């Protein structure tokens, strides 16, 4: 960051998180359980 | 009325400290405070300056603790140094020197107290190992001026001998107040020392340069000297070939042969002749 | 009123250990400290004080402050050793006088004399007379054993505030109850 | 009363002033005496600061007592 | 310990400064002060000055006065200013050793248990440097002597900034210098070596007269060191070592030959162009 009316280095910075980046971080229902899920759990067990 | 000579002398002490303190702030407006005497009329004097405990933001600063003044003043008085307060200083990065809108407040307040202070200002940022930047001021009378009066009286050429400057003008100096002449005036001691400052002791100059390493200088540039010669000769035949000054004007990017060919003597002559110079004497003066 | 600078050179030589005084000189002479600079401070409030001790060295402890108890908390831990030396004492309270911190006051010496001095009177005739001419005020307190050191005091002062100067004092005591008790407070207002 | 205030610069100034007086008071009289306004000047006292809500008394400032003034140094 | 002290100008102006004004307070032909400062890696840099009241009664030694508790309120005033710095060790502007000042250094050391001594002797007399450092060691003795307590010399050297030299050139406006290049070197190494070096032989020569029975003979170590000079300096001039002089002036003069042949024929060529210019442009505007 520099100072405006006479551009000197002022202070330092970590890196920026672009507003698109951050929303898609961290939204979701989030809540549900493999309970749920039935008739695949062989698919489940290839995935994780 | 005042008049147009009189001078300010400050004390070469404290330009120094005004500059190193000045160029620490780097981007903020550093201030001070300034001690002296008046000895008269077409004089006054600064003897030394102080620094102060103050916070800012950029845009602004200024001191906090008011005891830390009387304290530190009263206490330098047990060692010789019973002078006052005639002034202030604040140090401008870069913009240039000039008063403007609050330092004019701050200032007015000091000739309601005491009349014929002073205000100076300085530029870290700008001056370089030649020359540095200070100014003097002090405002103009708070109008009644419709009457068209002087601020001044004059009796000599003595204070017409510079120009101001642009940028001052931008911002009104003979239109609120008026600049005054800085003065040096050292005496005998120090600048008795102040030639000292550079000296370097006996211990080095009889000292000899290693032989080895010095021939491997000398036969680094012995082999550099080719090259130029070389180019030396195609730029001897081809000149007064087109227009004169196409000369130069294309000669913008390649390099002129003559001065890298001048300029590699200078280099084995001194060199040369110093080292056996020093050899051939001190080969006498011990045993 | 009057505005003056005292400085008190307390006593710490060996001889300090021994028993005429109840507990034992040294706690023969703090409270006569105590008391003392107490009256100088209330007698008028920027009246200032500093402390001195003879040993084989003079030793400075705090120069003139106007806060008494800089002094008392100072003065303890001091610690009988060693053999006394006047003159020397005399003269680095006298240096340490000038420096004074407002030089419209005038000054005094105060010294309480514990042991024998083994001094050559005609050294104490100059130092006197020099200080006579400098105007600086002495003051001495035979605190402790008056046989010795009773004559070479009393010409002392004799020659220095003598021709009818009348500013200088010396005063003595017997062994028996408290210097501040008895003794201080009886003379004249101090010293 | 009198009072003694002197500042940085040497000049002295002596005031007259009752014990209920406040320190408010007194910066008003001194802009009176010089035009200084009353928001720049700092006093002190015994060394340490005065400030407004009090009366002269309150600080116990005796009989030709001597005050400090020292101006507010700001820049920018 | 330390290896190398460096002194900044703000110092050494500070100290003339404080020298000119005591008259105002004494008649002393001494006076005694604090250095601020910093270091690393055992070079050390002193920054600061301050000065604190001192006195001492001349025809005695051990009578002296020394202000503790003004430095301490000082120090502590200074602190609120600048945290960078801290007590080093202290200067005096005398022109030589005194008796009492190991009993001085013994004092302030309670305020930083590795302090060094400056000497800054204001009014040079000579070519020379302004200053000498100094720290303080003890001595055995093969004599059987009691152990000493004495002084030991340091290296020193002036520094800059360039918020500083700035300042210092600006100032030097007082006379010649830079008489550039080959001007330079001969007088700054040369004259300026060998007016010191007779100083020094001077010195030593006055010495070896007080040992006519005007003073004890210091210490057998001296003689040992000065037998040691007169047995190192170089051997006569005398042998081959002459052969393989010769063979190094030929080889630095040789090129020298060849840089002034390079030197002349620039000049013809300069001449040349000199030349035909003049005669043609004349008849040309005639």
């Known amino acids: ?48 | 009325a005042v008049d147009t000579a009189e001078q300010v002398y400050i004390s070469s002490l404290a330009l120094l400290k005004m500059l190193k303190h000045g160029r620490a702030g780097v981007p903020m407006e550093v201030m001070g405070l300034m001690l002296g005497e008046f000895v008269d009329d077409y004089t006054v004097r600064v003897i030394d300056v102080f620094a102060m405990p103050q916070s800012g933001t950029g845009v602004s600063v200024e001191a906090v603790d008011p005891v830390f003044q009387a304290k530190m003043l009263d206490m330098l008085k047990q060692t010789g140094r019973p002078e006052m307060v005639v002034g202030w200083y604040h140090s401008h990065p870069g913009f240039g020197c000039w008063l403007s809108g609050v330092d004019i407040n701050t200032q007015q307040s000091f000739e309601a107290l005491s009349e014929r202070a002073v205000a100076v200002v300085v530029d870290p940022i700008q001056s370089v190992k030649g020359k540095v930047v200070i100014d003097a001021f002090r405002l103009i009378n708070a109008n009644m001026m419709v009457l068209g009066h002087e601020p001044r009286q004059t009796t000599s050429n003595l204070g017409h001998l510079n120009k101001p400057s642009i940028q001052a003008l931008i911002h009104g100096l003979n239109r609120h107040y008026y600049s005054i002449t800085i003065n040096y005036r050292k005496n005998e001691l120090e600048q008795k020392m102040l030639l000292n400052l550079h000296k370097k002791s006996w211990m080095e100059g009889l000292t000899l340069q290693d032989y080895s390493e010095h021939c491997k200088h000398n036969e680094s540039v012995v082999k550099e000297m080719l090259e130029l010669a070389k180019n030396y000769n195609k730029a001897v035949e081809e000149e007064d070939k087109m227009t004169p000054e196409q000369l130069a004007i294309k000669n913008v990017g390649k390099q002129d042969p003559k001065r890298h060919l001048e300029e590699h003597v200078d280099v084995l002559m001194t060199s040369n002749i110093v080292q056996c110079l020093a050899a051939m004497l001190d080969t006498v003066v011990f045993k | 009123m009057v505005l003056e600078s005292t400085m008190v050179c307390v006593d710490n030589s060996e001889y300090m250990r021994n028993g005429d005084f109840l507990p034992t000189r040294l706690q023969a002479q703090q409270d006569a400290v105590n008391i003392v600079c107490h009256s100088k401070t209330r007698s008028n409030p920027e009246n200032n004080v500093g402390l001195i001790t003879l040993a084989n060295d003079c030793e400075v402890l705090t120069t003139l402050t106007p806060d008494t108890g800089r002094i008392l908390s100072k003065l303890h831990t001091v610690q009988p050793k060693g053999k006394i030396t006047f003159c020397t004492g005399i003269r680095v309270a006298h240096l340490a006088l000038k420096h004074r911190q407002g030089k419209n006051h005038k000054m005094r010496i105060i010294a309480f004399v514990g042991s024998p001095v083994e001094d050559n009177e005609k050294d104490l005739v100059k130092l006197a007379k020099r200080l006579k001419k400098e105007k600086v005020n002495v003051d001495i307190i035979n605190f402790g054993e008056e046989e010795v050191n009773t004559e070479k005091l009393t010409a002392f002062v004799n020659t220095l505030n003598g021709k009818d100067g009348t500013g200088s004092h010396l005063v003595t005591v017997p062994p028996g109850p408290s210097l501040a008790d008895a003794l201080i407070s009886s003379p004249i207002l101090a010293g | 009363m009198q009072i003694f205030v002197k500042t940085l610069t040497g000049k002295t100034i002596t005031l007259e002033v009752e014990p209920s007086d406040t320190i408010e008071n007194v910066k008003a009289k001194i802009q009176d005496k010089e035009g200084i306004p009353p928001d720049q000047q700092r006093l002190i006292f015994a060394g340490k600061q005065l400030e407004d809500g009090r009366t002269l008394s309150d600080y116990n400032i005796q009989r030709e007592s001597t005050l400090h003034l020292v101006l507010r140094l700001r820049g920018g | 310990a330390v290896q190398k002290v460096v002194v900044h100008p703000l110092v050494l102006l500070s100290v003339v400064d404080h020298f000119n004004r005591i008259g105002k307070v004494g008649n002393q032909k001494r006076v005694v002060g604090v250095l601020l400062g910093s270091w690393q890696k055992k070079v050390l840099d002193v920054s600061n000055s301050f000065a604190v009241p001192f006195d001492e009664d001349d025809k005695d030694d051990s009578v002296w006065f020394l202000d503790h508790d003004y430095l301490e309120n000082m120090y502590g005033m200074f602190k609120k200013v600048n945290a960078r710095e801290r007590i080093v060790g202290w200067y005096h502007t005398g022109p030589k050793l005194h008796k009492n000042d190991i009993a001085i250094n013994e004092l302030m050391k309670r305020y930083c248990p590795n302090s060094v001594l400056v000497i800054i002797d204001v009014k040079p007399k000579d070519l020379g440097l302004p200053t000498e450092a100094y720290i303080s060691v003890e001595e055995v003795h093969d004599d059987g002597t009691p152990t000493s307590k004495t002084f030991e010399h340091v290296t020193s050297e002036i520094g800059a900034e360039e918020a500083e030299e700035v300042g210092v050139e600006h100032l030097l406006r007082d006379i010649k210098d830079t008489t550039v290049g080959t001007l330079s070197q001969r007088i700054t190494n040369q004259v300026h070596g060998l007016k010191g070096l007779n100083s020094k032989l001077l010195d030593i020569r006055s010495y070896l007269e007080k040992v006519a029975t005007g003073k004890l003979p210091i210490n057998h170590q001296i003689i040992y060191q000065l037998q040691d000079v007169f047995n190192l300096l170089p051997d006569v001039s005398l042998q081959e070592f002459v052969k393989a002089f010769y063979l190094k002036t030929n080889d630095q003069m040789v090129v020298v030959y060849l840089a002034s042949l390079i030197r002349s024929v620039v000049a013809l060529h300069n001449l040349i162009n000199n030349k035909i210019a003049n005669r043609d442009a004349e008849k040309k505007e005639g």
Do not use: F, K
Request: glycine fraction near 6%.
């Open chain 1, 1 to 48: 960051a520099l100072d405006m009316t006479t551009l000197t280095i002022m202070r330092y910075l970590p890196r920026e998180v672009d507003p698109l980046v951050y929303n898609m971080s961290h939204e979701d229902p989030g809540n549900v359980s493999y309970s749920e899920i039935g008739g695949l759990s062989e698919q489940i067990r290839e995935l994780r």
